[PDB]
């Protein structure tokens, strides 16, 4: 009966798009993560976002994003593998995309390695060319 | 016998005369911008403006000289 409209999955608002993975993109989150729907204990596709906390319940999904080493264990599939301040991590956020990122930045800034110099000025830090593009 | 910056010129397009030193000159005898400009442009009876990077422009054409003085 009742349809969705501005659901949450992080205390962050999420559109009621009528295919399930494409809603979760908002949570960051992208398509070639989600397709673990098999192991996420709602196997649904071709099914609305609105059917949440019924018997295709919400916290099923949520838990499998929090700790993916008991719903199956591959890496090459995780944002941060082999952290360089802890031994290993899984890492699937927000909220920590704008924290963990920022910390890497700060680390380089300090001891002044080349990647960190170039990024303080806002210049390109990879391969890259300038003087024709990008121009602001 | 005072010292006044020696106005210095350019011949652009063989019509116009741009005067680079305009801003500096106006400062020296302690008078403003627009008012000084008016007098000049009236006598010669030409158009042109100032604006820019405070270099004057005039539609008056002369053989390049120090005779602007």
């Amino acid at each position: 009966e009742q349809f969705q409209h501005i659901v949450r999955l992080l205390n962050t608002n999420v559109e009621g798009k009528r295919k399930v993975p494409f809603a979760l993109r908002m949570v960051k989150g992208v398509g070639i993560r989600f397709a673990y729907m098999v192991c996420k204990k709602a196997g649904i596709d071709v099914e609305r976002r609105a059917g949440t906390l019924t018997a295709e319940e919400l916290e099923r999904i949520s838990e499998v994003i929090a700790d993916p080493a008991k719903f199956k264990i591959p890496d090459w599939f995780l944002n941060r593998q082999r952290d360089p301040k802890t031994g290993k991590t899984e890492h699937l956020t927000s909220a920590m995309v704008d924290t963990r990122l920022r910390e890497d930045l700060e680390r380089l800034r300090k001891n002044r390695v080349h990647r960190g110099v170039r990024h303080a000025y806002g210049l390109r830090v990879r391969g890259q060319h300038t003087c024709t593009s990008g121009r602001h | 016998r005072n010292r006044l910056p020696e106005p210095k010129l350019e011949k652009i397009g063989k019509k116009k005369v741009i005067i680079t030193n305009f801003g500096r000159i106006c400062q020296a005898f302690n008078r403003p911008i627009q008012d000084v400009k008016d007098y000049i442009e009236k006598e010669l009876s030409v158009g042109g403006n100032l604006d820019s990077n405070d270099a004057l422009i005039l539609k008056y054409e002369i053989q390049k000289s120090t005779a602007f003085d």
């Binding site: 360089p84 301040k85 680390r107 001891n111 390695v113 | 652009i12 741009i18 680079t20």
Partner: protein, 132 residues
């Protein structure tokens, strides 16, 4: 403080060559394997020499080298190394967070540019820009 992989200084030092190159990134591993046969014959020695001799409460005497194609291992940490940008030996001391890098990265090889007004030929339209 510093954690390389959740390891303080003493664990890192304790590791043998095998256990070390396992722990580090892909480049570093690739490097070590390919090399063998010395390939930093002097750059080890010179450091460990002046390192040892110190009475502490201050850094080792500085050593100079041109080379920058050599890793940073936990052995050489605490030393003071020169690195050569093509006219200046540059001062760097080696922190515990410089492990898993090279030398050259800390030594700039150009002055960053900051400009100073564009001259004529910049702007296509013509005014013959006074005075710079």
């Amino acid at each position: 403080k510093f954690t390389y992989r959740g390891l303080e200084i003493d664990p890192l030092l304790a590791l043998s060559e095998e256990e070390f190159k396992t722990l580090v990134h892909a480049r570093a591993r690739r490097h070590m394997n390919r090399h063998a046969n010395r390939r930093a014959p002097v750059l080890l020695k010179r450091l460990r020499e002046a390192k040892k001799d110190v009475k502490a409460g201050e850094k080792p005497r500085a050593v100079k080298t041109h080379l920058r194609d050599v890793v940073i291992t936990p052995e050489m940490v605490g030393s003071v190394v020169g690195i050569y940008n093509g006219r200046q030996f540059n001062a760097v001391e080696i922190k515990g967070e410089m492990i898993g890098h090279y030398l050259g990265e800390f030594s700039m090889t150009y002055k960053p540019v900051i400009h100073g007004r564009p001259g004529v030929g910049a702007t296509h339209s013509s005014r013959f820009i006074p005075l710079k």
